[PDB]
Design a protein around this ligand. Structure first.
Ligand SMILES: Nc1nc2c(ncn2[C@@H]2O[C@H](COP(=O)(O)OP(=O)(O)O)[C@@H](O)[C@H]2O)c(=O)[nH]1
Ligand SMILES: [K+]
Length: 306
């Protein structure tokens, strides 16, 4: 009776994200690759691959046309549905601005939502250097995604330019963007498998994420003195997110630590999130005592209600 989580990459960036997460190792999660491009799809490492629009595109891409991606997805609805079937939670990841992701990712999410799955989008917006038409297409896709998901995390690719130095490889920067989805999925998966002392379950995840719009999904790990405060600051202060914690009115917050986890520092962590939100936050709070940890503390935050 464990919740089934799947991650679906749509289009090239989404396919890239899936491949990098599989390489990094992700257990108990099923991956699905959806694309118009057959070359990319044949190099995908996902167990489940769906080629959409083969008649439309002959296995090439949609060439940055969103209408092609939308039509390709709608005409493969049943295959997408079969691939999703059994899922309790679906993450759809895609780079907005192109044709396949922009057009197909909202269809995929709507399919998941109408199968009852808790449906979370994690998408990118294009770099400014890609031009205003691409940004405008991406914007339309972001809006379409919001209509189709339960919660949406947007990562403006421009924020990657804030976290590199002059030498950081592009693949390394892309992995920092991948960590938003990967660590969010892993945090939800760990919350679900492990009974905590103050317990949170999938139903608590649905309460914070179902039908909520923009969201924030963060993780923080710290040790030493003031660890709980520092871990909580880390969980809510990502430089890559379009939606910051501010104005968040619902929050799911789980703290994992060793047997040394004090009530005092749990309150400290929670106050850091309440204060940073600058609202009265509806907090769903959990704790998990993992004795294998020694002096390490993990704070997972999901915030919605914007
Ligand atoms: N962060 C990140 N952004 C990507 C990646 N690949 C593509 N992008 C971005 O996603 C947008 C759409 O590209 P792509 O996914 O290849 O288009 P599609 O396959 O035609 O939907 C691009 O304009 C880039 O902004 C990636 O691997 N990581
Ligand atoms: K649990």
């Amino acid at each position: 009776h464990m919740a089934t989580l799947k991650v679906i990459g749509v289009g090239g960036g989404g396919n890239n994200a899936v491949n990098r997460m599989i390489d990094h190792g992700m257990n108990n999660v099923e991956f699905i690759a959806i694309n118009t491009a057959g070359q990319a799809l044949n190099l995908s490492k996902a167990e489940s691959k769906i080629q959409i629009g083969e008649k439309l595109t002959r296995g090439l891409g949609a060439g940055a046309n969103p209408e092609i991606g939308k039509k390709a997805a709608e005409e493969s609805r049943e295959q997408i549905e079969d691939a999703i079937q059994g899922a309790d939670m679906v993450f759809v990841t895609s780079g907005m601005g192109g044709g396949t992701g922009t057009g197909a990712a909202p269809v995929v999410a709507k399919i998941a939502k109408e199968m009852g799955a808790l449906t979370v989008g994690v998408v990118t917006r294009p770099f400014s250097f890609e031009g205003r038409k691409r940004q405008t297409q991406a914007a339309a896709g972001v809006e379409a995604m919001k209509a189709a998901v339960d919660t949406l995390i947007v990562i403006p690719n421009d924020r990657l330019l804030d976290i590199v130095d002059k030498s950081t490889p592009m693949m390394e920067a892309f992995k920092e963007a991948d960590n938003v989805l990967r660590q969010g999925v892993q945090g939800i998966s760990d919350l679900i498998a492990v009974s905590g002392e103050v317990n949170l379950d999938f139903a608590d995840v649905k309460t914070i994420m179902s039908n909520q719009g923009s969201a924030l999904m963060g993780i923080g790990v710290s040790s030493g003195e003031n660890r709980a405060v520092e871990a909580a600051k880390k969980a809510i202060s990502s430089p890559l997110l379009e939606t910051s914690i501010v104005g968040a009115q619902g929050v799911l917050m789980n703290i994992t630590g060793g047997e040394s986890l004090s009530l005092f520092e749990a309150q400290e962590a929670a106050d850091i999130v309440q204060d940073a939100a600058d609202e009265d936050v509806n907090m769903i709070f959990g704790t998990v005592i993992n004795p294998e940890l020694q002096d390490e503390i993990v704070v997972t935050v999901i915030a919605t209600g914007f």
